[PDB]
Amino acid sequence: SGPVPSRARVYTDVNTHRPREYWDYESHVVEWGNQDDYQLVRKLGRGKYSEVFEAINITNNEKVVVKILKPVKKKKIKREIKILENLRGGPNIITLADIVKDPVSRTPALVFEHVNNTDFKQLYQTLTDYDIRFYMYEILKALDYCHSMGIMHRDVKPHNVMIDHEHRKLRLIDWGLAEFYHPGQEYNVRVASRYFKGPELLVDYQMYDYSLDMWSLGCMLASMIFRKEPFFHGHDNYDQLVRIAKVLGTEDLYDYIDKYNIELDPRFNDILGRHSRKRWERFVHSENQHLVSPEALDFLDKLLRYDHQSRLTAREAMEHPYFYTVVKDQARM
Ligand SMILES: Brc1cc2nn[nH]c2c(Br)c1Br
Ligand SMILES: [Cl-]
Numbered sequence: 001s002g003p004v005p006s007r008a009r010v011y012t013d014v015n016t017h018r019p020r021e022y023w024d025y026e027s028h029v030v031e032w033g034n035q036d037d038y039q040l041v042r043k044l045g046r047g048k049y050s051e052v053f054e055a056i057n058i059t060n061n062e063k064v065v066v067k068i069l070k071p072v073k074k075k076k077i078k079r080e081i082k083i084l085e086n087l088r089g090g091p092n093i094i095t096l097a098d099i100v101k102d103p104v105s106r107t108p109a110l111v112f113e114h115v116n117n118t119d120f121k122q123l124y125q126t127l128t129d130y131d132i133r134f135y136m137y138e139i140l141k142a143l144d145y146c147h148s149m150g151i152m153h154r155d156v157k158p159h160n161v162m163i164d165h166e167h168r169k170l171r172l173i174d175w176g177l178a179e180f181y182h183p184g185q186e187y188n189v190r191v192a193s194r195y196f197k198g199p200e201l202l203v204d205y206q207m208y209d210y211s212l213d214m215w216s217l218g219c220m221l222a223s224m225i226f227r228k229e230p231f232f233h234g235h236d237n238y239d240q241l242v243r244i245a246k247v248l249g250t251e252d253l254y255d256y257i258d259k260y261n262i263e264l265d266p267r268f269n270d271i272l273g274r275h276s277r278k279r280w281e282r283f284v285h286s287e288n289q290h291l292v293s294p295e296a297l298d299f300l301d302k303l304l305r306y307d308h309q310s311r312l313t314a315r316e317a318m319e320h321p322y323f324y325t326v327v328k329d330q331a332r333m
């Protein structure tokens, strides 16, 4: 028999109850603006693949960010646009300001509200305990919002979190891999960066949901409180599951495989071996012990589960004791 079907524990049917138009991005009609309303100032450093620029809107002299959409399926362009329009105004979600094409090249581009190109990866190995809790809570606001709106991000990693540390402001960026959640849909498992990939992606379980983002968030939290970048340091996608198995143990992995009747790639046969579930105390040392608390470990443990159904939801995570002081200071402020 095939794999056992799965449903999201929360926000399962939100797209079903919407008008077709909300999620049917292939039928979305874009009104393409004129990229000549903008002048590019400078290229932001986003590595070899990406083309993101600081720009000026000539009309109002306001600073924007312009993302040139590298040759790709028009379908993927409409998906990212529709998701950004749907989430516009959500907490800690980047704001889409315009959709334009260069008059000559006809290359499509997205224009965003300005944010400084200071990503979380540049800051997140130097935070106080309180600031890890604070920024984690701000990321959860964005994830509970997009999940509540029927969308999973699928590329949650420090490079996709822009922070203004002076103003204590955070934005979740790069919605290019985001997808609408539909119950029973089988998704592409070739998403997310290696170190942040959930076990569902690594064992090719396609009927995944919002809980994929909660695994990625757990990987970020583990990296920050233990000062270990990345936390799960695989050579490749096969070794990535081995690195997870040496921490979470093989017993819970094989129970997960049996529960969903997953056909494990034969390449895993010799490399997973047999591993105990390790106590988190094993990762604590003199240079990270100020970031590690019972509250932090209890919270992390509830994010990093093989079984996607078992992981905290974004809202359950926001309700964890780890955030009590952040919640109290927010109400007071
Ligand atoms: Br604003 C902003 C929005 C983005 N969407 N994808 N990548 C993005 C980057 Br880099 C920035 Br900065
Ligand atoms: Cl990253």
Ligand SMILES: [Cl-]
Binding pocket: 277, 278, 279
């Ligand atoms: Cl142990």
Ligand code: NA
Binding pocket: 289, 290, 291, 292, 293
């Ligand atoms: Na401690």
